[PDB]
Amino acid sequence: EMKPHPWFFGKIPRAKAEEMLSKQRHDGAFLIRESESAPGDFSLSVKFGNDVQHFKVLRDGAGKYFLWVVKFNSLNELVDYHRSTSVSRNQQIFLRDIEQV
Ligand SMILES: [Ca+2]
């Protein structure tokens, strides 16, 4: 179903990611943004209930992407994995695409 992935927001500020996501009405609504604070790095920003949480997408020498221990070959695979496995240590948070107008 190759369309643009409605999760990739390029370089947006952290506060803007929070403003757009806090308006979202579902838990797990999310985007990947390019970090202002760490150039060439990505952050994953997620509406969880009350609030918006940010994860840093970590990299290693082999160019893998990860949040915790499991390492992914692509951002696409990291995102999809977290559609069915909670991104959150404390809560059941599953990634779902934002809603556009
Ligand atoms: Ca909806």
Whole-angstrom distance, CA of residue 93 vs CA of residue 74: 20
Resolution, Å (one decimal): 2.0
**Residue 82: its H or E element:** helix 75-84
Q: Torsion angle of alpha carbons 36, 8, 18, 24, nearest 10°?
A: 180
Best CA proximity match to 56, nearest among 98, 97, 96, 17: 17
The CA-based angle 92-36-66, given to 5 degrees, is 40
Q: Which two tokens stand for residue 56?
A: 């840093």
CA of 29 from ligand 1 middle (Å) equals: 10
Alpha helices in the chain (DSSP H): 14-22, 75-84
Whole-angstrom distance, CA of residue 75 vs CA of residue 61: 16
CA of 47 from ligand 1 middle (Å) equals: 13
| Strand pairing category for 65-66 and 71-72 | antiparallel
SS3 22: helix
CA of 11 from ligand 1 middle (Å) equals: 25
